[PDB]
């Protein structure tokens, strides 16, 4: 499923992401834009045999288990398949753990590169939340 911007904003708001660990809702929408282009089925293979899964490109070495990744830690205690669902809930709940790790949203490279320090509110503007 490919979310619309305001569709995803409303879903993320319902999941309690607004100001989660200090990050306003626009940060989360922007992150999903640049991580996955709002595509819940996005995947990216890495050179360590891990794969990044879903709308927030969560990694299979550290966070979810896909059964094929060397050195798997599964800190979110979930199958990576759950992160390719059309509803965002498993991704969100694992993202809540990631963003709480100690370095905020810097975990997301696309967020660092294209969202951090920008007018992130623009991503929720017009959505009538």
């Amino acid at each position, epitope marked *: 499923k490919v979310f619309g911007r305001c569709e995803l904003a409303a879903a993320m708001k319902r999941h309690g992401l607004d100001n989660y660990r200090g990050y306003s809702l626009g940060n989360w929408v922007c992150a999903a834009k640049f991580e996955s282009n709002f595509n819940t089925q996005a995947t990216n293979r*890495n050179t*360590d045999g891990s794969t990044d899964y879903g709308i927030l490109q969560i*990694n299979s*070495r*550290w966070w979810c288990n896909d059964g094929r990744t060397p*050195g798997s*830690r599964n*800190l979110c205690n979930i199958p990576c398949s759950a992160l390719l669902s059309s509803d965002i809930t498993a991704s969100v709940n694992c993202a809540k753990k990631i963003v709480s*790790d*100690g*370095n*905020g949203m*810097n*975990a*997301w*490279v696309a967020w*660092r590169n294209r969202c951090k320090g920008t007018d992130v509110q623009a991503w929720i503007r017009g959505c009538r939340l």
Partner: nanobody
Amino acid sequence: DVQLVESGGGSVQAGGSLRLSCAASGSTDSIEYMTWFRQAPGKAREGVAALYTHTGNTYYTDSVKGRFTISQDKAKNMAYLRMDSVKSEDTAIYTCGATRKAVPVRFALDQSSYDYWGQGTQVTVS
């Protein structure tokens, strides 16, 4: 790929100070952590001090807390280890490591978390 190059090192008196430097080059944009490891004679490599480059947050092994300081110059892709109040037990080969993955803090002092390594530099406490 990322190349890491150490400078500094050598002999130092107990109680004294040395500074090590690590310069990264190559695909440096994606560097997440720069971290110092060491390996003392007859022992396994251990993580000493890790720095998360996008926040400046630092993580230390217990045996060096308060004495060693890791810092950076992010704009120059540099990491530094200032070793103050050195002890006998600090004699070791010190190696710079880096990774381009966003390793959980709890694994930031484990060597298997790292993808890129320098050459090692000897520090000897007399």
